Write a protein that binds this ligand. Structure first.
Ligand code: NA
Ligand code: NA
Ligand code: NA
Ligand code: NA
Lengths: 440, 422, 440, 422
């Protein structure tokens, strides 16, 4: 299998039990779905349906695991009174492709399908929910979100770091927010849980529901998250430039840094797609610099070109601690360090190689600020439509995720305790090995 | 979910058991690899009712993977490849990935590419067959179509096996629709009848994503991307004219997965006509009229398999356009000036290079095809289901087909986006 | 030289003399340019500067021609009172890439540089200037045109065909329009002259100034017109698909129809750029179908693939008269006719070719409704900025054009009397010959 | 216009006459082509003052074209090619177009590609030289960089001519900046000194469009396209942050043509810093402050040759970013939260495949290079001026360089778009 699950190095849960996977529901479902009609009643869920966590049998087959995930879907009875609920939205953390699509789909689903009273968009991450920031909140309506999905970034703006929980819920009450969608990563969702808790503490009828993005932070759970496919498309473009460079320099080395904090899916997938990576360094396979110089040496033994792909989360054990504004582990710029090591190594071996050039490409911002591909737009629209369905039906303290080709609901405590990482003995990483230089 | 199953026009099985899903393996695996876990067909249970959930279905699907003990003698194996049917993005990625994995992970004796489908296997065509080596395939993944060439239609299995036998092929990879796979079974059967040690392994091809026991086929994602661009052009044209209608034809012989996904992805379609929901021209005209009551523009997406009651179909893109023009003429009073632009981006969708993501996909399918074939698998196709890679016998894969579920979340989204009758 | 000039087959002028090239100027220049300051006075023209029509010497060198074109530029003295002038805009004919960029640049130049009183945008071509249509006129302001250049088509809309001249000028007076920009082709500009005349007839202080587009109509004068470069980019994309198809079919023929009414620049240039065209048919080289079947036969004599590029204006002498709604010559669909002839020819020769497939691609709408490339956006912005400069300075009855890498002003009567056509003995067409199949 | 001339760091001429512009031709044109018109340097006159206008300048430029009588014996000529300096889009198109025109229009005896610039011509590198035939170049136009490889720096002309003489090269095409062209003259001179019948013909290369007697160089248009995409990303980042600053570095060692054009094309730059307008960091900070008085976002475009007073330059993209962060820190009171993102898309601009339009351009320049070279032209470069193709001696082309005219219509447009001091 291509990937596997491992405990996060900052997990809220020590071990996941069926109970940890139980999704919280605001008390009560006193309203029929405004879209449910006798003819389409078949399309609305009456009871919570599940799907196995691990569809592997032990040897009808029984799962190797006791865990079950709740499937997301439109419900026949809902918690909030449609024409009276107020939806809020905020995008936190770094930007990535698809944020505007999520904002647009949440907005249009609320207005068109639920005839919601109003949709509010908070500016620049949690700051927009602070006493001072609340002042900048805007009203999102059909006309304001019609063509935003054609641009990168977020029209709401974003920012890293949490805000005083007391202040944030204060503004949510002050504005009459019933559902708050938190779009963002690990830290973003940790804040979401804190807000959810503060609200629960005050007895306020509020749901906080997360729409996660992962390529740019420590979070990594779903088989697919919005923005990933677009990042791969652009990563490949960066890899092609790196290859053009490398092949154009006698003993030239094209170094391209890609995203990937604890997982190397982006790098691993761009490496295979481009079919032009010679060395691929991911977080799951931490190797020393001597082994890297060794792979390069083996490459330059029968070639004048070398393209090295390197995930930002790789080689963190190579040098000079703590967490950034979003709560992610601080990182040393492996892109810069590696490029230097390579230039030092080829320097001290100027005799084995007459001339040598090392070129470093960092396409980070061009990958993050890129507009989404059509396939991500479809995914973004679907993640968002289901998020509105489940939150209107009272789901709270959870994120909408995608596992085994199905949309599920996962409590935030679980989502931030486990990580989806490359299985070095999986089909994907085996292709990268086949394609890249071999130690032996 | 978003799809449902329906008996394929030509099914070999009319019900499925667990044995039907077990993959056929050539006898013996003596050689060590130069370097069977199952998955549930249906991961849904039946309730958190204390202790490990049991699947609602008895069926299990075998997972594709490289094996430690393989069937063919690596250094002595010859690989053959043929691409049949209509072209779609990724064919070259499949050819390349197969070639390089056989040449680099197994050091096979040689790789052979037969030209223009099964034609290239018959006495006559066998002449064009070419030797595939690293250099010949190293950069073909930047082009649309197939370097080998393709063609529709079967040939005599006797002649084809004569060809395989003469060229000493141990593994023949058949890249094509269920039609080319049906022929693959007939080739596999003739060979076993002669006692020849050859595996016939298929790699599914369909832009439609019509293939059962599958959630995604290569080329399908590239198509949605290009279809969306086409819709962008249709919208541009439509919005630029007073009472303008932009008609866009999209792939979709028996299913409307591309049209539906492209409709949601673009969020610019006003009417989406698919083969799973045939409707009268009267209704289409009523939907168009409804749209024009509150707008001066209308984008109409139509799948090639729609309106056949208005071996295969007739050009519905032209018929529809013709009737929209007529409908507007007849009402030139209500709609003073009107314009109808027709867009058929068909060959521009299936003939373009693959998107990076499809490239990754094609490469993975191919790499896994060689791993399971080298380990004896035959009479099956490689496929992707529930985010995992599985082997599926041909008789099962070609017995059923995927189609839109007019009640799934995908179609529900296009219904909300499009004009409604009531 | 790559191209040449020939008389139009519907010309208003029988012969062009220096007088025909004299640009009309509304009477009076009583205002200093609101942007001219002592420091930048150097940047504003005091007198009309010229450039040779034909920079070829006879043998300081003297031109082979007596003709001189007026150069476009910001003027020190202008005709209209800035804060009081009202600018109007209308886009007519078929759409092409760059219309929104022209609308945006005209609008922002008027507002930002001239502090114009208002900019009006007329809907759907001249119809928007009819008594009924005038009703739909919109007000264009900074906020309405900020991001339109990112989309294909025209936000104002377009339409073919003229309207009653009496009605159009009636609305221009009724709305206080001082400058009317006519964006479009041959027919578009013929209407512009008619409006200009009607206005002159009434003694109204109005300027009608044209911003031409050509790829989709009979017009063809400048060395470069907006939208052309983008059309070539897309045409090449269509040619690649046609090649993928052709090479994938035994004796397969990829037929792709491109724009080009009286000129084959698009086809000729896409043919060379793509380096994958085997046969290229343009209007300047009308050949019979027998000669085409002959070229295909020579191609299939040593190959299984044939890509045929065909300009819409080619082979009009191949069959079944008059003008369309925009005033262009009616055309028979050479794309369809040619594809049929090829299928008939390969049919009657099924013996020489076992199997054969002919695939026809018509990327017309995908080329016309495409957003502009960045280079066209730059060109569009510059054409439009200069158009506003010259019209504010009283220029009327003319179009802004580009010749020999310079922006010039050309009276409409001249622009519609001559055509820029491929010189079959020029460097461009010689490359196409080198690349394509040879008769001998 | 939009550019002006300035003495090149290393000019050979310090004034120009008509003789300097006349192209040097090898003696004799005996053979018929297997299948000199001038243009005015300045097409402006001096007044419609009755009867045929006379140019303000005496200079005339020779127009490139295929000739009926040529210098070399077609079937016996050997062609050599080398790409030097930094890579830019279109190099492969140039190599390909040269190869195919020589092989298809002249049937030259052979085409040779020397590797990694002039290095490939020295005794040592001469070893890597490869034979260029149809198949080896038929699809290289889909890749960035150069297949031949490139390198900066000169080699000994003695060794290089030894190489040319040994391999029997009649024509050597030098693709590179004025540096590689200066070296081309030195190669042409050594060869004539030995009495060897060889033409050295240059094809100008510069993303900057710095080359004099030229209005456009290949690669320049592709760069503007990619630069605009980079600016799009910078804007996205900037608009997404409270008081965000997106800093984008663009090609432009001594000129800011790319930055200026990309600034207007995108219409999203708030500050455009180019080498033709050096300014203090104090002023840049004042422009940024002005912007932040009425907005929460700021895009700053900066050419690599700007701020050198803050053989070549130091990374101004990093310096500028460093100082913007410091400037904002020092004013964290006025700007509570601020963010500075730096974008250096340099290698992604020059290492990508060419846009179709540049492809057309490269092909045309190349095709014309072979036509004039085969007809004896030497010591010159092919160029495009006033929409026409002309031949220009190297000594003239490398004596002057184009630079932005801060008073032309291009720069005036970026001034209007960007924040103003007053
Ligand atoms: Na190299
Ligand atoms: Na419309
Ligand atoms: Na073919
Ligand atoms: Na901002």
């Amino acid at each position: 299998v291509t990937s596997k699950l491992v405990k996060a190095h900052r997990a809220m849960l020590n071990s996941v039990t069926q109970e940890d996977l139980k999704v919280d529901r605001l008390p009560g479902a006193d309203y029929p779905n405004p879209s449910k009609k006798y003819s389409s009643r078949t399309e609305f869920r009456d009871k919570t349906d599940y799907i196995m966590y691990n569809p592997r049998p032990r040897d009808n087959p029984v799962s190797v695991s006791p865990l079950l995930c709740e499937l997301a879907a439109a419900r026949s009875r809902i918690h909030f009174n449609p024409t009276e609920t107020t939806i809020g939205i905020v995008t936190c953390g770094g930007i990535c492709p698809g944020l505007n699509d999520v904002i647009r789909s949440i907005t249009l689903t609320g207005i068109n399908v639920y005839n919601v009273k109003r949709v509010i968009g908070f500016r620049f991450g949690y700051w927009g929910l602070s006493k001072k920031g609340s002042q900048t909140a805007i009203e999102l309506h059909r006309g304001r979100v019609t063509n935003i999905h054609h641009y990168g970034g977020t029209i709401l703006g974003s920012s890293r770091g949490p805000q005083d929980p007391k202040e944030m819920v204060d503004t949510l009450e002050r504005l009459g927010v019933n559902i708050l969608f938190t779009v963002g990563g690990d830290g973003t969702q940790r804040g979401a849980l804190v807000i959810s808790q503060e609200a629960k503490r005050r007895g306020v009828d509020i749901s906080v529901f997360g729409v996660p993005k992962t390529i740019d932070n420590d979070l990594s759970f779903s088989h697919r998250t919005f923005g990933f496919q677009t990042a791969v498309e652009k990563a490949v473009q960066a890899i092609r430039a790196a290859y053009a460079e490398a092949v154009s320099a006698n003993y030239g080395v094209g170094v391209v840094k890609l995203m990937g904090r604890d997982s190397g899916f982006i790098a691993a997938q761009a490496a295979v797609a481009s079919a032009q990576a010679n060395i691929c360094l991911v977080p799951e396979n931490p190797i020393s610099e001597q082994e890297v110089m060794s792979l390069l040496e083996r490459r330059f033994c029968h070639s004048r070109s070398c393209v090295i792909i390197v995930a930002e989360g790789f080689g963190q054990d190579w040098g000079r601690g703590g967490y950034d504004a979003s709560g992610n582990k601080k990182l040393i710029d492996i892109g810069v360090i590696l490029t230097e090591k390579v230039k030092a190594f080829l320097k001290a071996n100027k005799s084995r190689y007459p001339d040598s050039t090392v070129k470093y490409i960092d396409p980070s911002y061009m990958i993050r600020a890129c507009p989404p591909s059509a396939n991500d737009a479809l995914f973004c629209a679907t993640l968002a439509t289901l998020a509105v369905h489940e939150a209107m039906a009272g789901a709270t303290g959870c994120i909408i995720a995608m596992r085994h080709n199905n949309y599920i609901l996962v409590p935030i405590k679980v989502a931030t305790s486990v990580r989806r990482v490359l299985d070095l003995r999986g089909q994907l990483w085996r292709q990268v090995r086949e394609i890249t230089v071999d130690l032996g």
